[PDB]
């Protein structure tokens, strides 16, 4: 058999208050699941991921190809050579079934001084027009700020879990300048099954989306009810339990980076299932300038020899590396 992966359940809701003593009994959850298998599901979080998932799921369905060309990233639409990472990520029928649409921080205009010069990974979020589909801009600028503020609670169960103080990770994460983003991913229920869209592991597994570690300092993921997602554990991969109620929580190599691997980024892979469903993953990335010290939580001084990494650097080079192992998404 394939084993099962233990992924707590954690309450994260005392992270939202200020019982300090609860807050720290979170951490200590958050401590030992990011020490095993490194993923935990955060239930009682706030957000209204139902309201979620039906906003994702009546745009995915409607979309036409016309609106796809016209808010194709550059993989797909030469014309846009600015939208690498926003905008819609096309499915190719008979050989790529995912489907997606990314977009940024909103605060992102053309008057804002990381547009206004040039940085990289910084871009305007396209959208799709209004009447075709009303309210769904309005909807997802709304829920990148509820889950902002979860993954800033978040961040806060992290630092204290790593004995900092609370706002450790969180002062870096800051709603003008953060460069996390939103993905909503489709993958479709298709018969036939195009064969170019599955990939056979070493293992003799089919997968939708072969092995690697997130580019995020964490990431902060719902899907809906449809099991796909496996850990690599020393004795194999392990099956990651479907919860569409909670948020599936992993760290990513910036975390590992700045932990000196004591908090892993979990490798994970996406097993192929023939069945309709979603997964938005939110990465938590934080300002292009964003620096953070390294330290060593297993060392009585805390001190570590890896050298401090930019963010805008970190994530430059993570996005351009994952193309490359696992292909154009
Ligand atoms: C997280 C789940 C999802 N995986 C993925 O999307 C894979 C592995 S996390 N990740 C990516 O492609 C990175 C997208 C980054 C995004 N465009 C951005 O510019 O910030 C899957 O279900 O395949
Ligand atoms: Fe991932």
Same mark, same amino acid.
């Given at each position: 058999?394939?084993?099962?992966?233990?992924?707590?359940?954690?309450?994260?809701?005392?992270?939202?208050?200020?019982?300090?003593?609860?807050?720290?009994?979170?951490?200590?959850?958050?401590?030992?699941?990011?020490?095993?298998?490194?993923?935990?599901?955060?239930?009682?979080?706030?957000?209204?991921?139902?309201?979620?998932?039906?906003?994702?799921?009546?745009?995915?369905?409607?979309?036409?190809?016309?609106?796809?060309?016209?808010?194709?990233?550059?993989?797909?639409?030469?014309?846009?050579?600015?939208?690498?990472?926003?905008?819609?990520?096309?499915?190719?029928?008979?050989?790529?079934?995912?489907?997606?649409?990314?977009?940024?921080?909103?605060?992102?205009?053309?008057?804002?001084?990381?547009?206004?010069? %040039?940085? =990289?990974? /910084?871009? *305007?979020?396209?959208?799709?027009? +209004?009447?075709?589909?009303?309210? #769904?801009?309005?909807?997802?600028?709304?829920?990148?700020?509820?889950?902002?503020?979860?993954?800033?609670?978040?961040?806060?169960?992290?630092?204290?879990?790593?004995?900092?103080?609370?706002?450790?990770?969180?002062?870096?994460?800051?709603?003008?300048?953060?460069?996390?983003?939103?993905?909503?991913?489709?993958?479709?229920?298709?018969?036939?099954?195009?064969?170019?869209?599955?990939?056979?592991?070493?293992?003799?597994?089919?997968?939708?989306?072969?092995?690697?570690?997130?580019?995020?300092?964490?990431?902060?993921?719902?899907?809906?009810?449809?099991?796909?997602?496996?850990?690599?554990?020393?004795?194999?991969?392990?099956?990651?339990?479907?919860?569409?109620?909670?948020?599936?929580?992993?760290?990513?190599?910036?975390?590992?980076?700045?932990?000196?691997?004591?908090? %892993?980024? =979990?490798? /994970?892979? *996406?097993?192929?299932?023939?069945? +309709?469903?979603?997964?938005?993953? #939110?990465?938590?990335?934080?300002?292009?300038?964003?620096?953070?010290?390294?330290?060593?939580?297993?060392?009585?001084?805390?001190?570590?020899?890896?050298?401090?990494?930019?963010?805008?650097?970190?994530?430059?080079?993570?996005?351009?590396?994952?193309?490359?192992?696992?292909?154009?998404?």
């Amino acid at each position: 058999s394939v084993s099962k992966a233990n992924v707590p359940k954690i309450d994260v809701s005392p992270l939202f208050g200020d019982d300090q003593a609860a807050k720290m009994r979170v951490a200590q959850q958050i401590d030992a699941a990011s020490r095993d298998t490194g993923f935990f599901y955060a239930v009682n979080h706030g957000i209204n991921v139902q309201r979620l998932s039906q906003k994702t799921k009546e745009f995915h369905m409607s979309i036409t190809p016309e609106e796809k060309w016209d808010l194709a990233i550059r993989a797909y639409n030469k014309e846009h050579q600015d939208q690498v990472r926003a905008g819609y990520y096309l499915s190719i029928p008979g050989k790529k079934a995912v489907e997606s649409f990314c977009y940024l921080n909103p605060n992102f205009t053309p008057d804002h001084p990381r547009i206004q010069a %040039k940085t =990289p990974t /910084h871009e *305007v979020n396209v959208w799709p027009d +209004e009447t075709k589909h009303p309210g #769904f801009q309005d909807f997802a600028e709304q829920y990148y700020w509820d889950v902002f503020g979860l993954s800033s609670a978040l961040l806060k169960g992290y630092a204290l879990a790593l004995g900092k103080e609370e706002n450790f990770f969180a002062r870096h994460f800051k709603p003008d300048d953060t460069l996390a983003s939103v993905v909503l991913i489709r993958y479709p229920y298709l018969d036939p099954y195009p064969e170019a869209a599955i990939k056979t592991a070493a293992d003799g597994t089919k997968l939708s989306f072969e092995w690697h570690e997130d580019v995020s300092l964490i990431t902060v993921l719902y899907q809906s009810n449809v099991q796909n997602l496996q850990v690599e554990t020393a004795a194999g991969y392990q099956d990651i339990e479907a919860d569409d109620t909670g948020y599936l929580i992993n760290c990513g190599s910036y975390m590992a980076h700045l932990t000196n691997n004591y908090y %892993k980024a =979990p490798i /994970h892979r *996406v097993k192929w299932v023939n069945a +309709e469903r979603q997964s938005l993953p #939110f990465f938590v990335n934080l300002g292009y300038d964003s620096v953070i010290d390294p330290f060593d939580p297993r060392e009585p001084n805390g001190k570590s020899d890896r050298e401090p990494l930019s963010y805008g650097d970190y994530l430059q080079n993570g996005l351009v590396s994952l193309i490359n192992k696992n292909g154009q998404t």
